[PDB]
Enzyme design. Structure first.
Site, short mmCIF file in Angstrom:
data_model
loop_
_atom_site.label_atom_id
_atom_site.label_comp_id
_atom_site.label_asym_id
_atom_site.label_seq_id
_atom_site.Cartn_x
_atom_site.Cartn_y
_atom_site.Cartn_z
N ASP A 188 0.09 -12.80 -11.71
CA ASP A 188 -0.92 -13.04 -10.66
C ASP A 188 -2.00 -13.93 -11.18
O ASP A 188 -2.68 -13.59 -12.15
CB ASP A 188 -1.52 -11.70 -10.19
CG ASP A 188 -2.49 -11.89 -9.03
OD1 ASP A 188 -1.98 -12.00 -7.89
OD2 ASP A 188 -3.73 -11.90 -9.25
N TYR B 110 -9.62 -18.45 -11.13
CA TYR B 110 -9.55 -17.88 -12.47
C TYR B 110 -9.62 -18.91 -13.59
O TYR B 110 -9.82 -18.52 -14.76
CB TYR B 110 -8.27 -17.07 -12.67
CG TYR B 110 -8.14 -15.91 -11.67
CD1 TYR B 110 -9.24 -15.52 -10.89
CD2 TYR B 110 -6.95 -15.21 -11.56
CE1 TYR B 110 -9.10 -14.44 -9.91
CE2 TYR B 110 -6.78 -14.17 -10.63
CZ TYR B 110 -7.86 -13.78 -9.85
OH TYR B 110 -7.76 -12.75 -8.95
N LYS C 81 -3.85 -18.39 -5.36
CA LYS C 81 -4.64 -17.97 -4.23
C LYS C 81 -5.57 -19.10 -3.89
O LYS C 81 -6.11 -19.78 -4.76
CB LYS C 81 -5.51 -16.75 -4.55
CG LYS C 81 -4.70 -15.57 -5.20
CD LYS C 81 -5.59 -14.31 -5.31
CE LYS C 81 -4.82 -13.19 -6.11
NZ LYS C 81 -5.04 -13.34 -7.61
N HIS D 263 -7.43 -15.91 -0.66
CA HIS D 263 -8.02 -15.04 -1.67
C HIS D 263 -8.99 -14.05 -1.03
O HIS D 263 -9.11 -12.89 -1.50
CB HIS D 263 -8.81 -15.90 -2.70
CG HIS D 263 -9.06 -15.22 -4.02
ND1 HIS D 263 -9.01 -15.89 -5.22
CD2 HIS D 263 -9.35 -13.93 -4.33
CE1 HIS D 263 -9.26 -15.06 -6.22
NE2 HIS D 263 -9.47 -13.86 -5.71
#
Ligand code: NAP
Ligand code: IZP
Length: 303
Positions: free
Chosen positions: A45, A50, A79, A112
């Site tokens: 994931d 990120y 996402k 997201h």
């Protein structure tokens, strides 16, 4: 094993969480993603937010190149961040994530969060965002599409959209024994939408969003007692609880021992009494609890 999504693709039920805060060097995401695949994780994931898609994609490509896995054996998720909700920005955001990861497609692309942000809040019709997501699945950029951090009402908005082509395959949400999402999970089951739990181990407790006074899930006395009964660990109890509820569960670890320990979730099972004891911990506690979310007009926990 895997669960079959409502579009016919398969999702592995244990996923590796790749987020680590900025104080952790970017190079670690490469190293630990490789260790996760080595340990047996097949679902990975990630997200544009990120700032690790380059490393995570390189890890996946590295394990393909040395013969450990084939691309079809890996389920990779990214996402769409909330500054890219306007429909014309969706496909370029996904193409960008694919270029960072150097992959031809993601297995899963999620919205997201329902909380739109200036491309400062924004007001966007998320049904139009969704139509743009459907076009990315039709183009082969994403095998599957889903949402994240949607509540029941927000999920129904999509499900009820005139001329919907693809249901979300999943709704990835905060979910653990202190905030077990039972009613939402039931609603998702009624629609063949998979609930994917994040912060299933009680979150990374990041000072930006989590009160350090909040209970530490892995020190919970019931989870500790169950871990002693089963001669496992509180983390394993917390992961196994999700799998037995029919929830797909993520687990982040940047520690070689805990990455390997986490795949042990498939090695034991909890009884009905154990599951009732864990169900009894529910206390409406979301660890992410910050002014920066809670003031948003589409905050999902406004309930
Ligand atoms: N969709 C969203 O909005 C959203 C939001 C949050 C998270 N996520 C996703 O979900 C992933 C997981 O959630 P999370 O980041 O909140 O963390 P998590 O899975 O709840 O883990 C919390 C902490 O548990 C520790 N841990 C892992 N395995 C352990 C074990 N066997 N024993 C004891 N401690 C253990 C890890 O520390 P060590 O690293 O020191 O082992 C980790 O920092 C993220 O990485 C991200 O991929 C998505
Ligand atoms: C309703 C809010 C609390 C949901 C939400 C939680 C975490 C994230 C980011 C920071 C993430 O780490 O993926 C984004 C949105």
């Amino acid at each position: 094993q895997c669960v079959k999504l409502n579009d016919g693709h398969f999702m592995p039920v244990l996923g590796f969480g790749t987020y680590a805060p900025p104080e952790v060097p970017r190079s670690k995401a490469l190293e630990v993603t490789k260790l996760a695949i080595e340990a047996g994780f097949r679902h990975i994931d990630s997200a544009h937010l990120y700032n690790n898609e380059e490393q995570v994609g390189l890890a996946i490509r590295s394990k393909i190149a040395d013969g450990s896995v084939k691309r079809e054996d890996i389920f990779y998720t990214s996402k769409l961040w909330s500054t890219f909700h306007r429909p014309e920005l969706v496909r370029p955001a996904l193409e960008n994530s694919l270029k960072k990861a150097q992959l031809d497609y993601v297995d899963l692309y999620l919205i997201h969060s329902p909380m739109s942000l200036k491309p400062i809040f924004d007001i966007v019709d998320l049904c139009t965002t969704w139509e743009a997501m459907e076009k990315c699945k039709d183009a082969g950029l994403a095998k599957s599409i889903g949402v994240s951090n949607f509540n029941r009402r927000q999920l129904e908005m999509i499900l009820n959209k005139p001329g919907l082509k693809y249901k979300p395959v999943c709704n990835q949400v905060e979910c653990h024994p202190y905030f077990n999402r039972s009613k939402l999970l039931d609603f998702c089951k009624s629609k063949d939408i998979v609930l994917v739990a994040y912060s299933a181990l009680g979150s990374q407790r990041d000072k930006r969003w989590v009160d350090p006074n909040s209970p530490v899930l892995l020190e919970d006395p019931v989870l500790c007692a169950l871990a002693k009964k089963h001669k496992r660990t509180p983390a394993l109890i917390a992961l196994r609880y999700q799998l037995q509820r029919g929830v797909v569960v993520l687990a982040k670890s940047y520690n070689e021992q805990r990455i390997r320990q986490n795949v042990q979730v498939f090695e034991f099972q909890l009884t009905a009494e154990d599951m009732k004891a864990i169900d009894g911990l529910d206390r409406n506690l979301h660890y992410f609890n910050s002014d920066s979310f809670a003031s948003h007009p589409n905050y999902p926990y406004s309930d």
